[PDB]
């Protein structure tokens, strides 16, 4: 479960 | 588990274009993420290409922009790359990864040489 | 494009011994959002690549504590703490703060002996 970054 | 396959041709002609298969199992690439692709040519350098997003948005590196796109096939859980009109400088080791959207999940790399 | 600039090139440590590497930015990493991404990566011999390092300290999941990624701005350091053997191979710096994300030439650990 990967944390978001700006990009998404 | 999720886990990331290369295939394609390894050895492509110059002028020619390149084609490449990224195999996703254990998640959809229609649920979340971004579905990228990079390279290392030889000497170790490694170089972002771009991204295809859960939801179909591409993102291109702008040094490659008129030779790049990413596609996929939902139906076979698939992305892919293509570079038309490669050249020897092209030679390199092409990987698949996904993140969120910054790689974080790489594959196993795939050699394609280009050469005459 | 954000030249991303790693010293040394290559690092000979001593099994037990903590290593260092060095990372710069050609600008400042800090994002609008008040996040620094900066990114490490580890190549074993033979080997894809993989994630070590995210938000300049934050471990991937798997990674030992021995691993501490720290600095801010346009200046980042990765400690190795204890080095083993396993250790030896290439880590690469990268930002994926601008865009488009680029990465570090690399920089290679080998065990003295």
């Known amino acids: 479960l990967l944390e978001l970054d700006k990009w998404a | 588990d999720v886990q990331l396959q290369e295939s394609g041709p390894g050895l492509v002609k110059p002028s020619q274009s390149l084609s490449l298969t990224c195999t996703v199992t254990?998640?959809?690439?229609?649920?979340?993420?971004?579905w990228n692709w990079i390279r290392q040519f030889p000497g170790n350098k490694l170089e972002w290409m771009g991204y295809?997003?859960?939801?179909?948005?591409?993102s291109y590196n702008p040094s490659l922009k008129s030779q790049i796109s990413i596609t996929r096939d939902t139906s076979k859980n698939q992305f892919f790359l293509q570079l038309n009109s490669v050249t020897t400088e092209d030679t390199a080791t092409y990987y698949c990864?996904?993140?969120?959207?910054?790689?974080?999940?790489w594959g196993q790399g795939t050699l394609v040489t280009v050469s005459a | 494009d954000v030249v991303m600039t790693q010293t040394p090139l290559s690092l000979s440590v001593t099994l037990g011994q903590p290593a260092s590497i060095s990372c710069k930015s050609s600008?400042?990493?800090?994002?609008?959002?008040?996040?620094?991404?900066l990114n490490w990566l580890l190549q074993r011999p033979g080997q894809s690549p993989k994630r070590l390092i995210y938000?300049?300290?934050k471990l991937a999941s798997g990674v030992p504590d021995r691993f501490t990624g720290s600095g801010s701005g346009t200046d980042f350091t990765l400690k190795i703490n204890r080095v083993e053997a396993e250790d030896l191979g290439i880590y690469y710096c990268?930002?994926?703060?601008?865009?488009?994300?680029?990465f570090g030439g690399g920089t290679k650990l080998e065990i003295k002996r």
């Open positions: 990268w930002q994926g703060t601008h865009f488009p994300w680029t």
């Open positions: 295809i997003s859960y939801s179909g948005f591409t």
């Open positions: 254990g998640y959809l690439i229609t649920t979340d993420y971004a």
């Open positions: 938000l300049v300290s």
């Open positions: 990864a996904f993140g969120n959207y910054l790689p974080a999940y």
């Open positions: 600008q400042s990493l800090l994002d609008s959002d008040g996040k620094t991404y």
